[PDB]
A and B are shown apart, each in its own frame.
Chain A
Amino acid sequence: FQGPTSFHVIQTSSFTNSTWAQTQGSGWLDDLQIHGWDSDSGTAIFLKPWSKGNFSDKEVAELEEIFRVYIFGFAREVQDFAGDFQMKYPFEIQGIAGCELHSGGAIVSFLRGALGGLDFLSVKNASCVPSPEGGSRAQKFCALIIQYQGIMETVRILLYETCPRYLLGVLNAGKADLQRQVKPEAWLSSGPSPGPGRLQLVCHVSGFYPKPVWVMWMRGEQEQQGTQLGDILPNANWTWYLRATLDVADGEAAGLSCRVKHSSLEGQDIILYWRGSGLN
């Protein structure tokens, strides 16, 4: 099946001073957002009609309450221990946790934490593993948290028992959107001149879904190895944008074409031809 194969939640907790901290959170299928977190209410925002997957409204409300208590408690405890952990304000903590479906069917869970934009800890085999970037502070944190009754256990349940069944249920519940096929459009333009006597040609590809796509500059059936793929960029409403560039000498741009392949085109590639002398 196509589309996303993983689910995760993220946390960004920004500690401005010893009496002010705020958290942002959200839920995602790969890089498609399916949940928001509303700090006004301490409840989730369900961005798709299928965002609860196969979970009952009661189980969803229980999980929202776990996250509400966790968000409040996290800030409370970090502010209380900030002095002992020699924390200097402002600082920012990030967390990501979830699970993913692999080839062969296994579901693997993960939890990672960061401080100052650097890795701080991870959960491997239901244990807190300090990251070397986190130094003695991460060793101190892991020794402190694993003594917390309830937290370790709740994290274990959520990662290894709740997340896998949630993931399968939501990939199934959302399949009309997650496995839809949206066709790209493509166009050509100039790029910044790489230098004297040289041009850059740009092949733009936009509005496709799912994300896997193939774009190449061509001379007839010869693929130009100089083709440079840009990073995939997002559009609003779950489609993507990509630029494929080629740097050539002024007199070598004639004869070039851009070829686009995508799962939605049913084997009917898009071919665009570059014409020189301002003829597009």
Chain B
Amino acid sequence: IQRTPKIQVYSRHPAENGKSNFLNCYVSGFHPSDIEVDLLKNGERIEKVEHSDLSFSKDWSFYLLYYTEFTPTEKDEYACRVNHVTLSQPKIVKWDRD
């Protein structure tokens, strides 16, 4: 059996419009390990994103952390987009400070 990824999107610091922060996307609970993760700004892929080396939990499910600097604003939207063999389409989870 294959396991689909759980996707959690959160900021490092409380959102303050115009203040630099870090956007995190934690992808976990998936199997097999091959996966594609992008962070998006207003539907567009963010070019400079960092990520952890592969790890896995006690139940053998994989997990990764993707992150990047970002400056929240009232209008701009951010998200995490994931592709995996268990998904027929990319799964998008939006960042929501509220």
Contacts and interface: CB of A to CB of B under 8 A. Distances in A.
Interface string A228-263: 000001111000010000000000000000000000
Contacts of B67: 235-236
A161 to B, nearest CB: 25
Given A92-B33, A117-B3, A189 B12 contact: no
Interface residues of B, number: 28
Interface string A208-243: 000000000000000000000000011110000100
Contact size range, A: 20 to 34
A112 B56 CA distance: 13
B32 A235 contact: no
Contact of A241 (B10, B61, B98): B10
Interface string A22-33: 001010100101
A67 interface: no
Given A116-B31, A189-B97, 20 more contacts: A10-B56, A12-B33, A24-B54, A26-B55, A92-B31, A92-B32, A92-B33, A96-B56, A114-B60, A187-B14, A189-B98, A206-B12, A206-B13, A207-B12, A207-B13, A236-B12, A236-B22, A241-B10, A241-B12, A241-B24
Contacts of A233: 8, 10, 24, 26
Contact of B98 (A190, A207, A234): A190
B40 interface: no
B36 interface: no
B33 A14 contact: yes
Contact of A117 (B12, B13, B34, B61): B61
Given A119-B60, A189-B98, A233-B8, A204 B26 contact: no
A259 B55 CA distance: 32
Interface of A: 10, 12, 14, 24, 26, 28, 31, 33, 36, 90, 92, 94, 96, 114, 116-119, 185, 187, 189-190, 204, 206-207, 233-236, 241
